[PDB]
Amino acid sequence: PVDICTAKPRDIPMNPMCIYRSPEQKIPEATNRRVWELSKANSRFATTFYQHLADSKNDNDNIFLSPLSISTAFAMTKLGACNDTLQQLMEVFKFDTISEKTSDQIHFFFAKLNCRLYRKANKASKLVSANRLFGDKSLTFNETYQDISELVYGAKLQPLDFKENAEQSRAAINKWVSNKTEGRITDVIPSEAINELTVLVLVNTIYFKGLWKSKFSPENTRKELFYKADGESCSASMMYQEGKFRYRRVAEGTQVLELPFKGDDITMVLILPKPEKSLAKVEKELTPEVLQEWLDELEEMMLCVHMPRFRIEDGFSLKEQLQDMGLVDLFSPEKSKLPGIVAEGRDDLYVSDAFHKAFLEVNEEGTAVVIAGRSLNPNRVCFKANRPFLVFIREVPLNTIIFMGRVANPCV
Amino acid sequence: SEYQTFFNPRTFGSGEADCGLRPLFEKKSLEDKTERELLESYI
């Protein structure tokens, strides 16, 4: 058997059909440098992408996505891309910065990055996903590309009958995503998004619910108002607890909190601006550089946390955003170049759409209820998220942004 | 007559023999404001 999580680049040949060439922080412990430069590229992508997404939604809309899952998905098209289609992919996803070798086997190193993240979150936490590319059956796909796809992406491109059965193919895709995630993620693809001209569709969905390292007791949960950005109140279920947490009050009174999941390797980071400063302002003024700086400066202390329990199920087409960021030729029937995906003959292949959907569930649990005693451990500070705040889910050592979002409305 | 030791004074130290008798109370025939409140509760 071939273990991609232990195997090395040479163990199995999987070079792309085309390659590309364009004209400090300490490296984490026990980490491959290429997986690391890859993780840093995704963070640069997440910044630009989140920005476009926010400036396309309503300040009062929640957001939740996995830039990591998106970058991985488009690294699979990159595998068979050439010319301007490939260049655009590289520049938009920030792959045009990393080194040659990392760039050429990017799909492989993404598997490597993912292997590491999958086994860390599932130790105790809940991290399931369902990713796949679907092509119209009338086409003849490159078998070598298939073998590489199944090895490095979990599954190979799935042929469907879009020309004669668009709705049924639509239903099969939603049913398949739902199956792979035990009913957690449904209706990834909205009706109308798939018709008889569909040829290739990208689908990447991800779910999570980590077991809190220190959970909230339900008996301390109660309704309380939550002040949304528009100006309206809102009855939300506010959880509460006291414990030791990494905290920090930064510039302009913005508060940063880190709530770790069991294991400590994966944590949630909350950014809460002062009642005066809008979330939108922090969304624009924040970069990976400043975030890493805040995360570096956090101090551990006893404090109280008031946090609403919430649910965010955000799904959407990636097409418009990405084109707006410069990924154009990939979605164009006339200009697209993805020779590596199809067998030899002559291809007019291009991506019809790309869909993402991520689901985050947060409650008291995240088995015996724990208690801590009556010793004197005063709350130094108190973090009350009764207004819009940002959310990040990351892998500590590598600082990999796994999920990112905004809780603009938790109530009903 | 009333209290029988349990630990060996060698490793326990002094004071067990006279444990429980407050210098400013029992030993001075005095009671505190609410110890009566305790005896009442004793069925």
């Binding site: 414990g243 801590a372 010793s375 004197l376 005063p378 | 009333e2 404001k33 110890e35 409140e37 509760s41």
Partner: protein, 259 residues
């Protein structure tokens, strides 16, 4: 202590105040059972979830104190610790079952009208006094009420507080909480339809829950303030480590390590 009163001078001569050396801070309460041993709660020194692990050198005790901050010259006595012993099967991972610890002073402390050891129960004394309805006395310098905001130095008493509470039936204790209870604990406190109230709070852990013997008229420590959910919440009770039920381990540590 919630809903208590300023204890009288010398009312609790075995009360011990437990401090972390540096930075200095009041951690818990504790009791004097001899001139060299002090008993307290285990979670006051060891609690891995908060990276809390205090050892002999990080600790210090002040004995015979009344006021919480004013230095009481010629009355109170400070003592360092030679060694501390945590019950090996203390369950910090869930319910604080067997929440008990022993501490040996560097040098024996001298008794006075203000410093005096309390008695540990024997099977008989523990069988006749440990009955539901019967009241015991809890004491300490813990907070005066539950809080939900930043609270460093808030709600603290200027002098030792005291309150008397009635032992509750094991059936009622178990149904007041979803935290797996054990025979090594027992709960005290007034039921909702009793009107009166009171309880131990943050800072009282390790303190003694004592009872006066109607037999020999001596005070006995039956419990150790251990845990609760909030402080003095309606329909909830305070939990205490059952001292007698752990006397076997106490003896095991003493005539093995006080040598």
């Amino acid at each position: 202590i919630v809903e208590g009163s300023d204890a009288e001078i010398g009312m609790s001569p075995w009360q011990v105040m437990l401090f972390r050396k540096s930075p200095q801070e009041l951690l818990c309460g504790a009791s004097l059972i001899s001139d060299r041993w002090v008993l307290t709660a285990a979670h006051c020194l060891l609690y891995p979830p908060w990276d809390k692990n205090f050892t002999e050198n990080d600790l210090l005790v002040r004995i015979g104190k009344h006021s919480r901050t004013r230095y009481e010259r010629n009355i109170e006595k400070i003592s360092m610790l030679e060694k501390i012993y945590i019950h090996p099967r203390y369950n910090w991972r869930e319910n604080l079952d067997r929440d008990i610890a022993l501490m040996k002073l560097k040098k024996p402390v001298a008794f006075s009208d203000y410093i005096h050891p309390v008695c540990l129960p024997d099977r008989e004394t523990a069988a006749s006094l440990l009955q539901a309805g019967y009241k015991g006395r809890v004491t300490g310098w813990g907070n005066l009420k539950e809080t939900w905001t930043a609270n460093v130095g808030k709600g603290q008493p200027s002098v030792l507080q005291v309150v008397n509470l009635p032992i509750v039936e094991r059936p009622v204790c178990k149904d007041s909480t979803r935290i797996r209870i054990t025979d090594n604990m027992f709960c005290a406190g007034y039921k909702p339809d009793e009107g009166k109230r009171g309880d131990a709070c943050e800072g009282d852990a390790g303190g003694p829950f004592v009872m006066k013997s109607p037999f020999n008229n001596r005070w006995y420590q039956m419990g150790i303030v251990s845990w609760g959910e909030g402080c003095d919440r309606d329909g909830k009770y305070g939990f205490y480590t059952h001292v007698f039920r752990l006397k076997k381990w106490i003896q095991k540590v003493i005539d093995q390590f006080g040598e």
